Design a protein around this ligand. Sequence first.
Ligand SMILES: O=C(O)CCC(=O)C(=O)O
Ligand SMILES: [Cl-]
Ligand code: NI
Length: 366
Amino acid sequence: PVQAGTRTFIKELRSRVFPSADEIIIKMHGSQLTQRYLEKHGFDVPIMVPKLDDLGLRLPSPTFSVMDVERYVGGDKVIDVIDVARQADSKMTLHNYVKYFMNPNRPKVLNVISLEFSDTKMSELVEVPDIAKKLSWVENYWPDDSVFPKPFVQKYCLMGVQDSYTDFHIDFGGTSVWYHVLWGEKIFYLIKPTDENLARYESWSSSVTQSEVFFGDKVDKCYKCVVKQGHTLFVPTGWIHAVLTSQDCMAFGGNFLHNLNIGMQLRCYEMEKRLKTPDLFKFPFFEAICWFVAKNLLETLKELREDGFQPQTYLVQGVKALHTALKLWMKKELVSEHAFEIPDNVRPGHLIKELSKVIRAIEEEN
Ligand SMILES: O=C(O)CCC(=O)C(=O)O
Ligand SMILES: [Cl-]
Ligand code: NI
């Protein structure tokens, strides 16, 4: 049995020719990637931005080394590290990983994909794509006065050696991402969130054979997307993807929720609940933000109805979806474990009704 992350498994991965991600991804320039665009055409396929022009993406020169990270962040920090051959989580000092990295003669393949650096000297050196900041629920709807700490998941630094591999997952909470390769090369394997595929993914995720079964074989199309130095990949809600670090690589990235695919975001959250994913501890107060969002989304639909206007499709879909999930989390039987995410401001039962009544009309009123 070929085990994931092992050199044998890597020979096969490097051998398969996959349908090109050119079949589905949209290439565009910095300046085309706007809220306006995405509201009209949707954000349902990865968007590749070959040049970083007009993204608002500010980051270190292409020479920024693993050693420079160690400085700005602090070698003392204890970071998560993947033993790729074992597909398990390890810990070590940033200082050591840099030693391990800096030396050829790597006795094993070790990846760093989760090193969030907002609260460090290094943060000053990085500004995320304007588009991620424009869409992000944290940027738009997180009150300056809640008890829940603000999630910091916008600035990640990724260092990985050749043959680092991450297996097929859906990002925590169903968040979208951007990734930028500073040097080296990453290769994403991408799988559309059809229902066939999601379901198959939940199955595979809770099969004990998971690490012996390449989930790419289980779906009709698994798209290969090679992200080279200086390019910028944007992956939308729910997309199932694996990643291969084909060359020693440093990348930057960030995660964010937004209003476009609220339904898929919820589906993904409720699925990660079912699977008990530790990933979900990176966005602990997903539910809280959802409440804050339903407030704002309600207000917008109230303004459109009070003036005879018709709301865009994605807003009706999303609101209906929020409504279903707030209602679920409030059921008397489930309510004991959701109640703590209920922000002090919002009024659970009231809000849910105001949503119910708004969603009637729109339906019938259309
Ligand atoms: O580059 C990697 O190995 C994985 C990137 C990614 O998909 C993640 O960390 O969530
Ligand atoms: Cl967000
Ligand atoms: Ni990912």
